[PDB]
Amino acid sequence: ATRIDYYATVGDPLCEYSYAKSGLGFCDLDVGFGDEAPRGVLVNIHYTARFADGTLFDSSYKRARPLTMRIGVGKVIRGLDQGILGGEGVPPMRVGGKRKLQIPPKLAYGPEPAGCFSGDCNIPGNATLLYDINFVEIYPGSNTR
Amino acid sequence: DFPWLTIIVVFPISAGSLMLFLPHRGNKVNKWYTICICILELLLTTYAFCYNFKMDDPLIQLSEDYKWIDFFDFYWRMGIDGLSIGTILLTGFITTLATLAAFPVTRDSRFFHFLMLAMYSGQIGSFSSRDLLLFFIMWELELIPVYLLLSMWGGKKRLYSATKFILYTAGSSIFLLIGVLGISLYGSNEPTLNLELLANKSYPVTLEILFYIGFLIAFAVKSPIIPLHTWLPDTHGEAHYSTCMLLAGILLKMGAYGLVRINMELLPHAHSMFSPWLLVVGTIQIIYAASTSPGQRNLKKRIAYSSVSHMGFIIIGISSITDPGLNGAILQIISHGFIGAALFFLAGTSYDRIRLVYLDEMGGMAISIPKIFTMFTILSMASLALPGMSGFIAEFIVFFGIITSQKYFLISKIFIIFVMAIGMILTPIYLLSMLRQMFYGYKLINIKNFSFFDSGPRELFLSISILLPIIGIGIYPDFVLSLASDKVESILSNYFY
Amino acid sequence: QSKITHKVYFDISVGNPVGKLAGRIVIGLYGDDVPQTVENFRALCTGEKGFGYKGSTFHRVIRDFMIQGGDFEKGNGTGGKSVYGRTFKDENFKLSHVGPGVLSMANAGPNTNGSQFFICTIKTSWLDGRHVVFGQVIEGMEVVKLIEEQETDRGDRPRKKVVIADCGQLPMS
Amino acid sequence: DNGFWIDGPLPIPPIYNNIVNEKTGTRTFIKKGVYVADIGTKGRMYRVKKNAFDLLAMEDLIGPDTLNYVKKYLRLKSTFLFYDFDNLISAAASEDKQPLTDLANRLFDNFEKLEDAAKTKNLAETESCYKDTKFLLQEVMTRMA
Amino acid sequence: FDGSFIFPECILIFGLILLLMIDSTSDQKDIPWLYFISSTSFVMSITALLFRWREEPMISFSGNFQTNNFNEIFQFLILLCSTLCIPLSVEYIECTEMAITEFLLFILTATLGGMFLCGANDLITIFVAPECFSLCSYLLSGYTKKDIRSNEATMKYLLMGGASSSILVHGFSWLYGSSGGEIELQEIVNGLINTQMYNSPGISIALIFITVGIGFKLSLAPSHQWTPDVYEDSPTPVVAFLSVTSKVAASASATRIFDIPFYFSSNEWHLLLEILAILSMIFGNLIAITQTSMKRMLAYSSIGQIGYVIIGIIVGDSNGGYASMITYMLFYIAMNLGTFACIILFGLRTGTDNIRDYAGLYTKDPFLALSLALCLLSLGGLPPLAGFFGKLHLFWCGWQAGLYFLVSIGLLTSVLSIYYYLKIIKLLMTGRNQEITPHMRNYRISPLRSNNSIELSMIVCVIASTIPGISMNPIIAIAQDTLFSF
């Protein structure tokens, strides 16, 4: 709940989530133009991370650097790998893309309080997160390993 | 057209660089080779001056730029102002006479005359550069060669004075570096370094004051401003004559050059903020250094604090926001370049003859060395701001710049004129005390057994050849003011609106 | 523009100096509708407190989209304590993001308004319901365009530090 | 304005509603800082005579490779004449005012043309303007005497 | 599977196999051709690294090793250090009757460990390669084998280096736990915020223990007490090679494991590097005044110059890049190996390392005195030499990033470095017929082997301490194009 690490951003253009089979809130804002994201490679995204109500707890613009992620090998939430690559035939993202995602707590960290440093937690249970992914680029030399 | 100032500056280093090993293990070959190079460089300076320096146009003459580093935007900006060519001619002249006086040195004269030529190039590089960062390059390239001269040649406690000089000038040139970093980076959009492009900026007061302090603490040690002048009675007073006549002739007057070059046309408004304080500090400087001079038992330290005293007129003329003030400051730069050069030369020769440093000993020697006595007497008169000599008209035009100031009112001006005019009472006290100590009088033991050799014709040419432009300016002062008055008008155009 | 209550000025300085003063930003305040955000913004105009928008920057610039500033304690979008203690809520979103030059206060999500605003450029009326929307430019729209036309970096920060030199209250009210 | 050392702009003295300027600008021989003294109206009347005789007896200065000193001497003595005519017309008798200020205008345009002739290093225009400026300097001396 | 990107280290392991084949066949009848195949292995590795210049920054092995242009540059600097330092022990081995074989092996494998530390990307290799290099360091330091002080000093160094790497890897363990089970620097910052451990005390202890271990590797003034004690008895060529190569590979890691997995805690990261940098700049240059030794005060001057390098570490890629740090490391290698070449030649001709024996070098050997004086003035930076422009580029980037209290302290300690440098230059210029020592008066330049390669590499380092300050624009032009460090 608390320890939200206040980073006042400007928000992102809201849209309706064309849902998936696995319950993913899914809304592709800006179709990228280039190659699809490969499975298992390092990719660089920007995102603003939000709770159910939309309050921010994390941002790549907080860190002012695209977050490098090896997607598809399960090093992240399955919501990331199913909303960027696509599990049930959901179309994978192209470079320079933007997409909102409503991660359901089935795909997200359950009712488990993800992150609890000292009494208080980073994420409460069943947070049903809202990610706003700006998939900007592939990592320049990246491998599927 | 022609790379004028580049072949001016690089010629003493690149021509002294032919002393690689050069197997001639006396001082004759490299001695005459270096006086040949210094004469050739002086003739290069005069040929660039008499034939391609328009004394009317108050702009950047003999302009030249190269590329050195693209990241700094650091060029080889060379160019002469009206305030610069007096110092360049003073540089070439005084350092050529310095290596003339540097003939009878024979310890390691190869490395000595090579560093003489290294100073003789680096100083003209400092005065000729239209760049901040190249001014800093040459401001610290004039540091290690005159260190190596100071420490290995001349003076009792010359090691202490040499390390004190090099650490003091380095620990102020870091503030000069802070100033050039500030102006180049946080000066304006498009970070540049050409002073042709840079003297026309806004520079608000909370930034311009910090720039001005960053250069004033830099230049305040080199033109010795009395919070920061501890380096000078050691550096000048414990050096021998040929290095000290350029340490006092031209090395002391850069900085005061920079207070006209960097701290007056680049930063006008904060100079108008702090020149009320620099005026009071210069008036305290003249009295303070003229009163520390009778306290010096040493001979050469009296001339060192005399140099600190005469720099007060330069600080005052710079702080006097006027054409007569700044023009008397340039005149005092050239005048006291001659004066300090000749006095430290004659003090070094007097120590070489008499072998007595202090003035409780070394009584009446004027019957023993009358040529040194008459030249030292006439150059003491030149130091007295006494007429027919350039120091007179220098200090009087500084007084005239005080009394015709639009910056100051009568309440200040009366106090400033009074305190400065006590200085021309205090200056006869120590100068004539020096004269009545080391020359006037009679010692009973000194009759015929010693029979000291007088001034030879070389040293007498040194003294006469410095004396003649002092007289030629003291009777016709437009040998200095006419080559710079146009540029000082271009300076004060930024101050009077 | 429903009842501009307090016209208020604050002036910027683009580029490398701190007092370059390339124009100014004279804006208005709809204080009748929002008392809290307009009161915080008036207290951040040098107010009566020592803290304000003097020395604060525009730490984010996005082209064809709003620019973001107001953070005085930090300079990345974190130090944003208010005059109502540290952080207060949102109030009565009557008017909307009608286009260029709005002083809508930024926040993380609901009920977390701080010291950070953003100046809208293009017509983006979709920010309603989350950001409280108030303020309107009247002088210095080309100055905001001059802020936005600067080339930015990877972290969406301006390469020239666009810092607010002064902030004070006009005698309009 | 703390008594000693008024600071900042360092102004020049203004013109007291006189038409003594060029009107396409103020004047082109204005030396920036000179000390004209507040002596009195007869003192200014005499110093007009003195500096008018100075620019009269500028004969032996004019010559080749000397035009810059001609320009500096002109700017100096004409700045003295400028402030002294400003005080004289500023303390005029309301019927001597208009012919003397017309005299000052037709003198100062002559000074402008001579300063431009000596500024461009052209000796023929220098002497051809110095002829009737010698006429007008004799005229203003025999007016002030 | 084909990792062709690690071909300059394949040339190194090829040279190691040839070293062992020569070290198994005859064992006595090959001193100089072994040095030939080793030096040409260096030159072939350099020309392979230049043949692979324009290649993509591809992570070659299975998420294990990244051949960035930044890593290529630092591998090039380690190869240049090894090339310009490898002739500096062709006379020391024949003077001290040690084995030139397995010494060349030690230098080749220390170069190997440094070049893998530059491109290391898993946390495994950022322990394997530094301590590959450090076990080679302990074998190089315990190599004189004639006394008690050298062996006790290298044993204390082995204790402190094991403590160094173990604190560094305890911090790596807090990375490996706090960031889930993730390694690979690009994936570790992902693993912190997958587990929501960015605002955690565990990652704070991770950063503190990692920066303490790197400060042990960088010998910054909290963790700096090893270098003077361990550079007395350890021989001067390995003092040169190990100090310079250790600090260039440690600045390689100090960029590498500090920008990619620590751009979230960059505030406390910059504050810790600022504390260690300011204390290092002050205390190295303030101890190095008052020591009568020559290699100890050189070790403290190396500490102060690495404290200058940390100003380039703290600045990012943007507001004055790491390119200034790169070109100052190039200058640092170039003007430090010349200093150590002169210190080696004072000891291949005298045998002593006491600084008071230097009184009278100008009269006996003006060439070596000129080379040492010019290298020390490059290290101090009074005329336009290399080190002055390196410190200028550093202080430029620090002033443009706004790090005012870094640049001002760096300038004051640069003046403080100027003092003990010209304290040395007093001795090797002057001489007064009894201030000269009997270890100096019998200099004997003529009882020498041949036209040596120590003199060649020494004058290459002197020219590389003089002209690249003048010719810095191609070096900055080739260093600014390292933007993939992230």
* SS3 state at C172: coil
Q: According to DSSP H, which parts of chain D are helical?
A: 41-56, 67-90, 97-119, 123-144
Please tell me the distance from the alpha carbon of residue E112 to that of residue E90, in angstroms, as a whole number: 20
Q: What angle do CA B15, B18, B19 make, to 5 degrees?
A: 120
Q: With an 8 Å Cβ cutoff, are A77 and E194 in contact?
A: yes
Which residues does residue A46 pair with via DSSP β-bridges, in sequence order?
Answer: A134
Q: Find all residues with CB under 8 Å of E431, minimum gap 6, and list them.
A: E359, E360, E361, E362, E363
Measuring CA to CA, which residue among B147, B3, B149 is closest to residue B77?
A: B3
Q: H or E element: which one contains A135?
A: strand A130-138
Q: With an 8 Å Cβ cutoff, are C109 and A10 in contact?
A: no
Cα→Cα distances A132→A11, B103, C65, E467, Å: 9, 82, 16, 53
In this structure, the number of other CB atoms found within 10 A of the CB of residue C94 comes to 12
Measuring CA to CA, which residue among A46, A62, A54 is closest to residue A7?
A: A62
Measuring CA to CA, which residue among C78, A143, B80 is closest to residue E65?
A: A143
Please tell me the distance from the alpha carbon of residue C65 to that of residue C47, in angstroms, as a whole number: 29
Please tell me the distance from the alpha carbon of residue B126 to that of residue B138, in angstroms, as a whole number: 5
Chain B partners (3+ C-beta pairs within 8 A) = C, D, E
Q: Report the phi/psi class of residue D21: left, alpha or beta, with left for phi > 0 and alpha for psi in -120 to 50.
A: beta
Chain C contact for A6 (CB, 8 A cutoff): yes
Please identify among residues 22-41 of chain D the ones whose CB lies closer than 8 Å to any CB of chain B. Answer: 32-35
Q: H or E element: which one contains B426?
A: helix B410-438
B482 neighbourhood in chain D, CB within 8 Å: 69
For residue E23, give both structure tokens.
């070290």
Q: Find all residues with CB under 8 Å of E370, minimum gap 6, and list them.
A: none
Which residues does residue B20 pair with via DSSP β-bridges, in sequence order?
Answer: none
Q: Are E397 and E320 in contact (CB under 8 A)?
A: yes
Please tell me the distance from the alpha carbon of residue B342 to that of residue B464, in angstroms, as a whole number: 9
- Concatenate the DSSP letters of all residues of B454-471 into one string: ---HHHHHHHHHHHHHHH
**Which contacts qualify for D138-142: CB closer than 8 Å, 24 or more apart?**
D138/D56, D139/D103, D140/D48, D140/D52, D140/D103, D140/D107, D141/D49, D141/D52, D141/D53, D141/D56
Give me the torsion for CA of B8, B14, B15, B21, rounded to 10°. Answer: 170
Please tell me the distance from the alpha carbon of residue A45 to that of residue A132, in angstroms, as a whole number: 10
Please tell me the distance from the alpha carbon of residue A79 to that of residue A22, in angstroms, as a whole number: 9
B272 neighbourhood in chain D, CB within 8 Å: 7-8, 10
- Nearest chain E Cα distance for residue A130, angstroms: 15
For residue A68, give the nearest of E56, E58, E186 by CB distance: E186
**Dihedrals phi, psi of B74, to nearest 5 degrees:** -100, 110
Measuring CA to CA, which residue among B92, B118, B436 is closest to residue B250?
A: B92
**String of b and e for D108-139 (b: at least 16 CB within 10 Å)?**
bebbbbbbbbbbebebeebeebbeebbebbee
Find the length of chain A: 145
Q: According to DSSP H, which parts of A10-144 are helical?
A: 60-63, 78-81
E182 neighbourhood in chain A, CB within 8 Å: 75
Please identify among residues 28-57 of chain A the ones whose CB lies closer than 8 Å to any CB of chain C. Answer: 50-51, 53-57
Q: H or E element: which one contains B259?
A: helix B256-265
* SS3 state at C21: coil
A62 neighbourhood in chain E, CB within 8 Å: 264
Top residue of C64, C113, C130, C131 to mutate, by most chain A CBs within 10 Å, is C130
Q: According to DSSP H, which parts of E52-101 are helical?
A: 69-85, 92-96
For residue B137, give the nearest of E384, E418, E429 by CB distance: E384
Nearest CA in chain E to A4: E199
Give me the sheet containing C8-13, strands edge to edge.
C136-139, C25-28, C8-13, C163-169
In whole angstroms, how large is the CA radius of gyration of chain E? 22
- Nearest chain A Cα distance for residue E194, angstroms: 6
Please tell me the distance from the alpha carbon of residue E64 to that of residue E380, in angstroms, as a whole number: 40
Please tell me the distance from the alpha carbon of residue E397 to that of residue E389, in angstroms, as a whole number: 12
| Active site residue ranges of C | 60, 65, 68, 107, 118, 127, 131
Nearest CA in chain C to A6: C78
Measuring CA to CA, which residue among A47, A51, A94 is closest to residue A69?
A: A47
Q: With an 8 Å Cβ cutoff, are E411 and B71 in contact?
A: no
Please tell me the distance from the alpha carbon of residue B317 to that of residue B285, in angstroms, as a whole number: 13
Q: Are E300 and E378 in contact (CB under 8 A)?
A: no
Please tell me the distance from the alpha carbon of residue A129 to that of residue C89, in angstroms, as a whole number: 22
A68 neighbourhood in chain E, CB within 8 Å: 186-187, 189-190, 260, 486
Chain E contact for B178 (CB, 8 A cutoff): yes
- Concatenate the DSSP letters of all residues of B120-175 into one string: HHHHHHHHHB-BHHHHHHHHHHTTHHHHHHHHHSS-TTHHHHHHHHHHHHHHHHHH
Q: With an 8 Å Cβ cutoff, are A118 and E201 in contact?
A: yes
Q: Find all residues with CB under 8 Å of B32, minimum gap 6, and list them.
A: none
Chain B contact for E409 (CB, 8 A cutoff): no
Q: Tell me, what amino acid is at B105?
A: V
Chain E contact for A1 (CB, 8 A cutoff): no
Chain B contact for E208 (CB, 8 A cutoff): no
- Nearest chain E Cα distance for residue B192, angstroms: 13
Give me the torsion for CA of D48, D53, D58, D59, rounded to 10°. Answer: 150
Q: Find all residues with CB under 8 Å of C26, minimum gap 6, and list them.
A: C7, C8, C9, C137, C138, C139, C140, C170
Nearest CA in chain C to A44: C154
**Dihedrals phi, psi of E286, to nearest 5 degrees:** -100, -15
For residue B295, give both structure tokens.
């306290």
Which residue reads 């005195």 in tokens?
E369
Domain locations along chain C? 1-173
* CA atoms lying within 13 Å on the CB side of residue E412: 12
Please tell me the distance from the alpha carbon of residue B434 to that of residue E33, in angstroms, as a whole number: 74
- Nearest chain C Cα distance for residue B178, angstroms: 16
Please tell me the distance from the alpha carbon of residue A81 to that of residue A135, in angstroms, as a whole number: 13
For residue C45, give both structure tokens.
């105009």
Domain of B155, in residue numbers: 1-497
Cα→Cα distances E84→E73, E323, E454, E476, Å: 16, 22, 9, 21
For residue A136, give both structure tokens.
């900007």
- Nearest chain E Cα distance for residue B168, angstroms: 9
Chain B contact for D69 (CB, 8 A cutoff): yes
Q: Report the phi/psi class of residue B38: left, alpha or beta, with left for phi > 0 and alpha for psi in -120 to 50.
A: alpha
Q: With an 8 Å Cβ cutoff, are A8 and C114 in contact?
A: yes
Q: With an 8 Å Cβ cutoff, are D10 and B272 in contact?
A: yes
Say if strands A25-30 and A97-102 run parallel, antiparallel, or are unpaired. antiparallel
Cα→Cα distances B318→B262, B268, B286, E456, Å: 12, 12, 14, 53
* SS3 state at C118: strand
Q: Are E396 and E320 in contact (CB under 8 A)?
A: yes
For residue A65, give the nearest of C68, C87, C155 by CB distance: C155
Measuring CA to CA, which residue among D128, D125, D121, D138 is closest to residue D55?
A: D138
B202 neighbourhood in chain C, CB within 8 Å: 17, 19-20
Q: With an 8 Å Cβ cutoff, are C106 and A9 in contact?
A: yes
Measuring CA to CA, which residue among A134, A81, A128 is closest to residue A103?
A: A128
A70 neighbourhood in chain E, CB within 8 Å: 63, 184, 186-187, 190
Q: Tell me, what amino acid is at A135?
A: F
In whole angstroms, how large is the CA radius of gyration of chain B? 22
Q: H or E element: which one contains B29?
A: helix B28-52
Q: Tell me, what amino acid is at B87?
A: T
Tell me the longest C-alpha to C-alpha distance in chain A.
45
Instruction: Name the experiment that determined this structure.
Output: cryo-EM
Chain B contact for D14 (CB, 8 A cutoff): no
Q: Report the phi/psi class of residue B260: left, alpha or beta, with left for phi > 0 and alpha for psi in -120 to 50.
A: alpha
Please tell me the distance from the alpha carbon of residue C140 to that of residue C9, in angstroms, as a whole number: 10
Chain E contact for A118 (CB, 8 A cutoff): yes
Please tell me the distance from the alpha carbon of residue B47 to that of residue B88, in angstroms, as a whole number: 13
- Give the number of domains in chain B: 1
Q: H or E element: which one contains E239?
A: helix E236-259
Q: With an 8 Å Cβ cutoff, are C108 and A6 in contact?
A: yes
Say if strands A130-138 and C136-139 run parallel, antiparallel, or are unpaired. unpaired
Q: With an 8 Å Cβ cutoff, are B206 and C18 in contact?
A: yes
* SS3 state at C10: strand
- Nearest chain C Cα distance for residue A34, angstroms: 20
Cα→Cα distances B313→B307, B308, B402, E359, Å: 10, 10, 11, 44
Q: With an 8 Å Cβ cutoff, are A14 and C131 in contact?
A: no
Please tell me the distance from the alpha carbon of residue B30 to that of residue A13, in angstroms, as a whole number: 81
Which residue reads 């394949």 in tokens?
E10
- Nearest chain E Cα distance for residue B244, angstroms: 20
Please identify among residues 247-286 of chain E the ones whose CB lies closer than 8 Å to any CB of chain A. Answer: 260, 263-264
Q: Are E306 and E224 in contact (CB under 8 A)?
A: no
Chain A contact for C124 (CB, 8 A cutoff): yes
Q: Find all residues with CB under 8 Å of E78, minimum gap 6, and list them.
A: E111, E114, E115, E118, E245, E248, E249
Chain B contact for E400 (CB, 8 A cutoff): yes
B273 neighbourhood in chain D, CB within 8 Å: 7
For residue E93, give both structure tokens.
């081995």
Q: Are B81 and B57 in contact (CB under 8 A)?
A: no
Chain E contact for B71 (CB, 8 A cutoff): yes
Please tell me the distance from the alpha carbon of residue E465 to that of residue B18, in angstroms, as a whole number: 21
Helices E404-427 and E386-400, interaxial angle, to 10°?
170
For residue B276, give the nearest of D7, D35, D68 by CB distance: D7
Please tell me the distance from the alpha carbon of residue C80 to that of residue C107, in angstroms, as a whole number: 10
Specify the resolution in Å.
3.9
